[PDB]
């Protein structure tokens, strides 16, 4: 069907199984002193994390104070200059002998592809943390400073009123 | 190879986010009538803590199951209103998820 | 919107679940 069937073990665990789970896990721990499914109550025991700390799904694999970059910068600049130079040479190829133009085209793309690699090491979450950091920091400083400004102006008004009433005495 | 129970339970949890899946599951009588399914739903609650929460793909179902948790004391009735209510309350629920995680 | 791009949706894809190994796992639930 369109919707896959519920998992099979879901139907094994009734309320009685839930209430008898404590004694079952106590007995299992006492006896113990891929997990084989010898009893229907085994699944409620929390599954163990794989030792390799890896998870595979759909053909793809998955697994501290914030809780020479100049070399990369100059590499990027020289790569951009070489990319412009190669673009000029490739368009010249198109001009004179376009029949073999593709011979350079993908080459240029490789440099562009390398640029993407040069982005990968530069990857930005810390920079986003920084920018959010300063925006809420400056917002709270603005709120604070307007607080002492308003309380100070109220105090100044109170002192002026006190002087006015003392003069009228 | 045969996938482990981790993979199937995680995929079930992430598929619970679909409104069509929830509507289909609640359409059948014996799914809600059987206490086994709700027992499994309450068993699934323990994935809201790390490091299990680091392995999720769509955080919305995190509330949905919790919303489904509410369904055990709110009633089936309300199945018809489920798509409308999720569409209407998507903004504030996304905001509260962001507050729970992004802050 | 009209171009169905793979592996990037807001909600879990129905085709992703169909192609996921959970489908055959449910089919091979007897073998489990």
């Amino acid at each position: 069907s369109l919707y896959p069937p519920p998992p099979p073990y879901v139907k094994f665990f009734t309320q009685s199984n839930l209430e008898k789970l404590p004694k079952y896990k106590e007995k299992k721990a006492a006896s113990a002193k891929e997990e084989e499914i010898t009893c229907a109550l085994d699944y409620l025991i929390p599954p163990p994390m794989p030792k390799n700390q890896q998870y595979r799904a759909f053909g793809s694999i998955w697994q501290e104070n914030e809780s020479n970059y100049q070399y990369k910068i100059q590499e990027l600049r020289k790569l951009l200059k070489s990319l412009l130079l190669n673009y000029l040479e490739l368009i010249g190829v198109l001009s004179i002998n376009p029949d073999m133009y593709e011979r350079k085209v993908e080459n240029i793309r490789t440099i562009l592809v390398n640029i993407h690699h040069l982005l990968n090491e530069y990857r930005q979450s810390r920079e986003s943390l920084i920018m959010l950091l300063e925006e809420q920091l400056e917002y709270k400083r603005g709120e604070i400073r307007e607080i002492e400004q308003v309380c100070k102006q109220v105090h100044d008004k109170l002192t002026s009123i006190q002087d006015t009433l003392r003069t009228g005495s | 190879p045969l996938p482990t129970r981790f993979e199937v339970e995680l995929e079930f949890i992430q598929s619970l986010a679909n409104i069509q899946y929830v509507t289909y599951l609640l359409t059948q009588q014996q799914i809600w009538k059987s206490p086994n399914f709700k027992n499994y739903l309450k068993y699934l609650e323990y994935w809201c803590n790390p490091p299990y929460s680091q392995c999720i793909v769509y955080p919305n179902c995190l509330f949905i199951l919790k919303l489904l948790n509410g369904f055990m004391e709110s009633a089936l009735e309300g199945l018809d209103e489920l798509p409308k209510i999720i569409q209407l309350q998507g903004p504030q629920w996304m905001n509260e998820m962001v507050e729970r995680w992004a802050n | 919107k009209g171009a169905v791009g793979p592996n990037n949706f807001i909600w879990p894809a129905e085709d992703a679940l169909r192609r996921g190994m959970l489908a055959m796992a449910s089919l091979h639930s007897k073998e489990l």
């Binding site: - | 359409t27 018809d80 489920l82 409308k84 | -």
Partner: peptide, 25 residues
Amino acid sequence: PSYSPTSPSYSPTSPSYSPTSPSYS
């Protein structure tokens, strides 16, 4: 003429009961 028209009694909240099954290829 027409004494009174009918009040709109639409029920979009109705979930419908369309059976879906031939999705697998």
